């Protein structure tokens, strides 16, 4: 009975966080990332390699990526759990809204999984760059290994920025989906 009191407090604090995230936390991050990669940019001005100088420059950009990735996982994880807690008792028929809920959870799970996979992929960059660099010392005249380093940085630079665009696109798709389908998400 003591836990029953403790439990009801838990459900209330989540509900607050969910509304707070949709009215403030999610829109604010949309504008934040938009200021970094503005939609009005001419083609090629975002995904370029003009501003690219261990690669000390790349370390700081991934650190920023990890911050952006962290904020996504933390916000969505509680929102996803909240939708799960809002799934009604399983019944036969008149459960069209749970299908909407499942689609929302599916999309929410897709974006979190997408951001989760960024952490292993960034490790692959350092692993691949270090491995190729070892080969240059053993075989100093095969010039393509040195060219491989250059293209890897160019690929990663592009990959970093497409991820930032993907950040923007994920935040709006989540915000747009819940807003339009709000009535079926809350009362199924």
């Amino acid at each position: 009975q003591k836990i029953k009191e403790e439990y009801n407090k838990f459900k209330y604090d989540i509900t607050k966080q969910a509304i707070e995230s949709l009215r403030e936390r999610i829109p604010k991050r949309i504008i934040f990332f938009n200021n970094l990669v503005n939609v009005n940019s001419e083609p090629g001005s975002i995904l370029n390699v003009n501003d690219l100088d261990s690669h000390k420059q790349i370390y700081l950009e991934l650190e920023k990526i990890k911050t952006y990735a962290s904020e996504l996982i933390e916000i969505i994880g509680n929102i996803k759990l909240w939708i799960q807690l809002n799934v009604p008792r399983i019944e036969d028929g008149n459960n069209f809204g749970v299908g909407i809920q499942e689609e929302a959870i599916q999309e929410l799970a897709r974006v979190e999984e997408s951001a989760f996979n960024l952490y292993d992929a960034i490790v692959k960059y350092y692993m691949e760059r270090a491995k190729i660099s070892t080969k240059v010392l053993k075989y100093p005249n095969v010039s393509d290994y040195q060219e491989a380093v250059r293209e890897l940085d160019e690929k990663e630079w592009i990959h970093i920025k497409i991820t930032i665009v993907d950040m923007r696109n994920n935040y709006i798709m989540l915000y747009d989906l819940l807003y339009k389908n709000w009535e079926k998400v809350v009362k199924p």
């Binding site: 019944e91 036969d92 028929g93 008149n94």
Partner: protein, 224 residues
């Protein structure tokens, strides 16, 4: 055809209840000197008129009725409601009682649920009026059952509007006091502030014929 569900209910009937929760809101309140029924005549533009689109209709000299669902199903359940109010007034002397009228219309809505090939009625009625035993205000659920309600709402957002009545309706309330609480519950849930001659209210008015309040009469109550 409507068929049973493995959990023990009707699937097609449950979808009919989802139709009355997405239409113009209605409101029925029973007082101690008559009953009142309200609605929300959502004006789409300035092309339609007020003399034809009616959410309040008459069945006899003391029977009121409102809808909460399909607009096209207005003129079909009303046609059979008048005929059963006439057939009873032919085989018997006086007018039709509300309990004898609801137990007849409910047998028509229920018959259009079990019979194959038909679609359940997508509306929720509110039959009110003066009876020789007092005042009644029934409600016809699309499944076919009915309730002997005292004060209720059936249209869109019938959950918060129902709670706004339980905290604002005593057992003894006069008609003029019930009219003020009727418009109060409508504006507490209706969107916008355009509530100006967009509500059609009927009234039993203590053993007198059914008089639909005009546009110049509803403004007298709306200002209070």
């Amino acid at each position: 055809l409507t068929t049973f569900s493995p959990t023990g209910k009707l699937v097609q009937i449950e979808y009919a209840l989802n139709r009355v929760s997405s239409s113009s809101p209605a409101l029925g309140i029973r007082a101690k000197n008559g009953v009142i029924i309200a609605t929300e005549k959502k004006s789409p533009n300035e092309l339609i008129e007020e003399n034809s689109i009616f959410k309040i209709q008459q069945i006899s000299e003391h029977i009121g009725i409102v809808y909460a669902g399909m607009p096209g199903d207005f003129r079909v359940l009303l046609k059979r409601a008048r005929k059963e109010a006439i057939r009873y007034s032919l085989q018997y002397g006086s007018e039709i009682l509300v309990k004898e009228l609801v137990k007849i219309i409910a047998s028509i809505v229920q018959e259009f649920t079990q019979t194959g090939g038909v679609r359940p009625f997508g509306l929720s009625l509110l039959i009110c009026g003066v009876d020789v035993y007092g005042y009644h205000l029934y409600q016809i659920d699309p499944s076919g059952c009915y309730f002997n309600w005292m004060a209720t709402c059936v249209g869109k957002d019938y959950q918060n509007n129902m709670s706004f009545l339980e905290k604002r309706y005593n057992k003894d309330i006069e008609i003029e006091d019930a009219i003020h609480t009727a418009i109060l519950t409508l504006k507490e849930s209706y969107e916008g502030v355009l509530n100006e001659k967009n509500i059609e209210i009927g009234v039993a008015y203590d053993n007198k014929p059914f008089k639909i309040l005009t546009q110049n009469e509803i403004k007298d109550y709306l200002i209070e």
